[PDB]
Write a protein that binds this ligand. Structure first.
Ligand SMILES: [Zn+2]
Ligand SMILES: [Zn+2]
Lengths: 107, 186, 46
């Protein structure tokens, strides 16, 4: 990440001193000792998952005493939750029911 | 480098990744409570958005002119320096200034009451500055430092410089061209 | 829309009209102020 000197406002570089790593200016004496953990997270875009779960994938989220689906009122349906973008997104819930003479997709 | 790398079917435990990640960087060399190692809390490096300067720590919406004047009246009685931009000509005549219908500015007028400032219902704000009413709106929200300073050349070669205070908010005054024109269309 | 709040009087002063300057520091944030820093000189051309 860009961080800039309070004195002259040139761009800082990270270098190493005799006791700590420092943010340092190239044009003035200013240095800033890294005393504690500092971080910067990118969170890039993941792949699409839409065509990855279709067609009898290896899902696993089903559990004992799980709810029945609302149309058929039978537990013959899978349900899962996934991030669609990066993991800062709140996870979305989705479910699909597959029964005899009955095909549907629901949200 | 061995290329035929091996893999297994077992599912990674959630906490096992979390605690492995934790142990990789939670180590700290903060034990050096010494002068060099110490760091000045009021000279942190500047993260680039100036409202968002704090990147390292000890651990927005937009206001409107009705709200600005309400905060400085009820919630806080402290005085504050606004900075306001007026139209290029005020509705006056330069008094005896030896002219031509030239522009009128605040430098030409004389001290006293100059007008009245009205806050209406629904947040409309007007500056009634004569017979005419000028509209007042919030200017660009500056977040760099601004200082209001006197300079006085009290002597031929020397003088005094004095800092009177910081300036936070900008107001823009403009003529209400719809009202001026709805009087007498063309 | 009647003026239900803050009919504010507006007054004008001229005693500093030839003296008053606005200084602004485009690269210094509003929280870091030069109020503590000792100043050694000031120079102007009027
Ligand atoms: Zn610097
Ligand atoms: Zn079904």
């Amino acid at each position: 990440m860009l961080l800039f000197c309070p004195g002259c406002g040139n761009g800082l570089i990270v270098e190493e001193g005799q006791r700590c790593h420092r943010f340092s200016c190239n044009t003035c004496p200013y240095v800033h000792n890294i005393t504690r953990k500092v971080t910067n997270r990118k969170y890039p875009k993941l792949k699409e998952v839409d065509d990855v779960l279709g067609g009898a994938a290896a899902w696993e989220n089903v559990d004992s005493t799980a709810e029945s689906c609302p149309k058929c009122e039978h537990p013959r349906a899978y349900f899962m939750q996934l991030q669609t973008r990066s993991a800062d997104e709140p996870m979305t819930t989705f479910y699909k029911c597959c029964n005899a003479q009955c095909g549907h997709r629901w949200r | 480098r061995p290329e035929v790398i091996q893999s297994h079917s077992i599912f990674e435990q959630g906490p096992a990744e979390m605690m492995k990640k934790k142990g990789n960087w939670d180590k700290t060399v903060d034990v050096s409570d010494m002068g060099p190692s110490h760091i000045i809390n009021i000279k942190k490096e500047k993260r680039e958005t100036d409202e968002e300067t704090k990147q390292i720590l000890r651990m927005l919406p937009k206001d409107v002119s009705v709200a600005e004047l309400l905060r400085e009246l009820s919630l806080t009685k402290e005085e504050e320096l606004l900075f306001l931009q007026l139209p290029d000509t005020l509705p006056g005549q330069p008094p005896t200034q030896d002219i031509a219908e030239n522009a009128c500015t605040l430098a030409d007028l004389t001290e006293g009451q100059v007008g009245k400032l009205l806050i209406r219902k629904s947040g409309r704000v007007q500056l009634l500055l004569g017979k005419v009413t000028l509209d007042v709106t919030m200017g660009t929200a500056c977040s760099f430092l601004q200082e209001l300073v006197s300079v006085g050349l009290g002597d031929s070669r020397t003088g005094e410089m004095t800092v009177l205070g910081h300036v936070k908010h900008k107001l823009v005054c403009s003529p209400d061209f719809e009202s001026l024109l709805d009087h007498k269309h063309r | 829309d009647d003026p239900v709040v803050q009919e504010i009087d507006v007054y004008l002063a001229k005693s500093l009209a030839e003296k008053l300057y606005l200084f602004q520091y485009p690269v210094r944030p509003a929280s870091m102020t030069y109020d503590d820093i000792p100043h050694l000189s000031a120079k102007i051309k009027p």
